[PDB]
Subunit: 259 residues, 3 copies
């Protein structure tokens, strides 16, 4: 089987791939330090709950990229019969191996970082427990079935079937984000910053299943190095600037979020 | 090294095993649709919290059966010396490999579904946080040790030690169902419906450890084909028919569970 | 998958040190559960009982953890990266010599489950709000998970220590809540004396873990697998079993102080 050090060497040796992971390790790390410094003045527990939940997003992110760049959460899988990338090979150093580079480390950690994005947003919008629970549970289900899709190599049909279940879970999250929380925000007095984050979230999040479908996991029209940067670019907005904006607001409106 | 492709095909060529899986994938999916249209009328956040966790049971189920049917969450493990299934073979294709067919995928997802059934029941009985936390934590411990039980291939005795630990956690759950929530349901005003679901749950759940003990995992007096159906049958009652009854009540008494 | 669970199971056995460090705690943990259940029988206030159940779950996670290690289910033989002081080591498993080191990752995996429980009890005992409980618990979990990643990384020596550093960062957050935040909250909750004792006990023992990790095979390798295992089992006996014994001992004589809601 392929070795962890080999995937690690495969990431290096490939500038596109290496830069998409190592840059976000630095960016997530700097984001954490920046965010902690920005909220060192909060005093209200609810505002502080929102801040910590937000800060956890890049915390999980930095561990995710370290797991990917270290080769710990990457594997070489062979696609099933009729998969647009079946018969492909990867080549580690001087050897060649059948399969595609499957970076499942992303799908796995999303199940931990996205619930946190949703938690901060829901709270910021004055959501009640029932909606938080719904958004979060289905969001986690979306991430897990997506991971399952990437890890399934027995059938091409199964892969897209998992993908469909994940899409169904995704619409549930979309519904509360666009319909439910958009209304709550007004009642909480945060409609302004929410609108911004909601639009940002929805637009960025929609990009993930597109990239998945266009990359080696899907119809393989994009290389692993390209698909990886697309995700990394999405992360920079959906996580880092998204967190900067929320915490920039939060620190200037601690009283309104206090309740 | 057995490939996922082989286990998938192995599920075929064996109508008994295959049917028990694909049939529940459809019953789960259908159940979800029904439940969504049944709870369309609810407007009480507490009533909707109960319905969402109830709906999450079949949602986790479709995913579990898909993982199993696809071969993702199935493995062939050689049982330890002295084990009644030790020395068996499976033969995936034209070749024959030592071991048994372990469907650990079921034990894994229970740690996600069972907690949802319990959340529903606990909320119905007007349980307090302490009793909810107790049932859910010990319930998860029950599932995970069962999974550990099934994956232990080093010692026959260790497998059974796991089994015991799992049974001990099980009694904790049974004790809050039969004794604790039974009393709480009175103050809530749902002793009626609770008594029904409560009696249903306990009897069905009580059957899982028995199937495990009889199947290839335990004494091996039952073929994987029958053992699989036993669980499938049990799920249909412990999950789908159970969810329907709870949701049916809920939709007719939203004012009762409200608050 | 050359190294089978069986070989690992038998490697533990036939190695008195290692075996004893695992089996002794399967017994100590089990006896602890019984003792704690027995001790808490007379509790009635739901909040007091939350603290008790949270505390009791600690030895529950522990008995399962040790079973996973002794059974060989959560142990693996891994080859250390170039530069690691243990690179080029052999374990001699079964009737063959195997490259690598015996990595007991099962300990790290379960800490993510038991430590959050130690923290819930303490936090509750200190009369903590939800924000601090949530912060303490998520960073505690992050600490455990990144510690597990550190021991599971075999590609690069620098990556291993980088995971370790991230994990340490998570650790200071837990240490700051315990030493700064809850220390003050306990004064308001009327549990100052007992929290401070348990605060110190917890802080002192928890510092032992990253030290053992650094000194043992996963780290600079001055401690062979058998001795790093016993060090952790020794730490667990104090940080889990006796820590819980002392907390439950106080709780059962002061149910009213923590009664609240
Ligand atoms: C890896 C790395 C840096 C890691 C840094 C970490 C983990 C620091 C986390 C700090 C936190 C969570 C502080 C809590 C405050 C709230 C404190 C409390 C409520 C507990 O009193 C607040 C207002 C949110 O800043 C760099 C490269
Ligand atoms: C493997 C093994 C032993 C396993 C033992 C188990 C699983 C026992 C769990 C008991 C519990 C949780 C008791 C709950 C009470 C509270 C009850 C409640 C709030 C639910 O009414 C209380 C006062 C805390 O003892 C031994 C060897
Ligand atoms: C920090 C990471 C973020 C915000 C990730 C978001 C990911 C998604 C919205 C992923 C969605 C997917 C589907 C809807 C279909 C199946 C595949 C996925 C997992 C890529
Ligand atoms: C939808 C699934 C349900 C309701 C599953 C319930 C499962 C159990 C009550 C399993 C219990 C087990 C034991 C108590 C001992 C060891 C083996 C198990 C995992 C079958
Ligand atoms: C029952 C187990 C307990 C109380 C375990 C405590 C473990 C720690 C405080 C571990 C900390 C670590 C770091 C700060 C750095 C990396 C390695 C670890 C996981 C040993
Ligand atoms: Br606070
Ligand atoms: Br992430
Ligand atoms: Br609602
Ligand atoms: Br399930
Ligand atoms: Br209680
Ligand atoms: Br543990």
């Amino acid at each position: 089987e392929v070795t962890q050090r080999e995937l690690f060497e495969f990431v290096l040796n490939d500038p596109l791939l290496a830069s998409s992971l190592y840059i976000n390790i630095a960016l997530a790390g700097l984001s954490i330090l920046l965010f902690v410094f920005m909220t060192r003045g909060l005093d209200d527990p609810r505002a502080k709950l929102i801040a910590v939940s937000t800060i956890l997003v890049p915390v999980v992110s930095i561990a995710s990229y370290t797991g990917l760049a270290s080769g710990l959460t990457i594997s070489v899988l062979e696609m099933p019969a009729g998969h647009f990338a079946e018969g492909s090979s990867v080549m580690l150093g001087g050897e060649e191996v059948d399969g595609v580079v499957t970076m499942w480390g992303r799908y796995l950690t999303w199940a931990l970082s996205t619930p946190m994005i949703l938690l901060a947003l829901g709270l910021l919008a004055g959501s009640n427990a029932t909606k938080l629970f719904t958004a979060i549970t289905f969001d986690i289900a979306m991430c897990v079935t997506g991971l399952a899709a990437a890890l399934t190599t027995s059938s091409h049909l199964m892969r897209w079937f998992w993908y469909a279940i994940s899409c169904a879970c995704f619409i549930v999250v979309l519904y509360i984000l666009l319909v439910e929380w958009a209304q709550d925000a007004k009642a909480a007095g945060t409609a302004d910053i929410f609108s911004t984050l909601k639009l940002l979230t929805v637009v960025m999040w929609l990009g993930y299943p597109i990239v998945w479908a266009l990359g080696v996991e899907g119809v393989a029209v994009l290389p692993v190095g390209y698909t990886s940067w697309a995700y990394s670019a999405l992360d920079i907005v959906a996580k880092y600037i998204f967190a900067f904006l929320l915490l920039n607001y939060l620190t200037s409106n601690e009283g309104v979020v206090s309740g």
